[PDB]
Amino acid sequence: GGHPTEVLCLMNMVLPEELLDDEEYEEIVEDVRDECSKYGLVKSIEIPRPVDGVEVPGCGKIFVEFTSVFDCQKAMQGLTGRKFANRVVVTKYCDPDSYHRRDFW
């Protein structure tokens, strides 16, 4: 996209119809927390859910946030083509102004 930041945009983890279970979602945060800390420190992860069946803009992504740009730059390449569920993971940079909000598309 544009300049790198400490966030990471990822796709092909979750499905538009699997973000419903409360006792699965919170495990999936910690699952990725352990894995991505191998390259730095994942500050947090951001998984917008559907609304009672309804789709939202920026659904079906995940964004991850690090505690330095320079660690995220290692992860983003180093974990291109990992499997953060069962599928592939493609990676991308994102912008953090949108990250801290729900400004997803």
Give the strand order in the sheet containing 42-46: 42-46, 61-66, 7-11, 90-92
CA 67 – CA 40 distance, rounded (Å): 8
How many other CB atoms sit within 10 Å of the CB of residue 5?
18
Query: CA distances (Å), 101 to each of 3, 21, 42, 63, in order?
Result: 19, 23, 18, 12
- What single-letter DSSP state applies at residue 27? H
Whole-number Å distance between alpha carbons of 82 and 39: 13
Q: What is the dihedral of CA 56, 8, 42, 73, to 10 degrees?
A: 180
> To which H or E segment does residue 42 belong?
strand 42-46
CATH dotted code for 1-105: 3.30.70.330
What is the DSSP annotation of 74-101? Answer: HHHHHTTT--SSSS--EEE---HHHHTT
Q: Where are the domains of the chain?
A: 1-105
Please give the method by which this entry was determined. NMR
Neighbour count for residue 70 (Cβ, 10 Å): 10
CA distance 94 to 68: 14
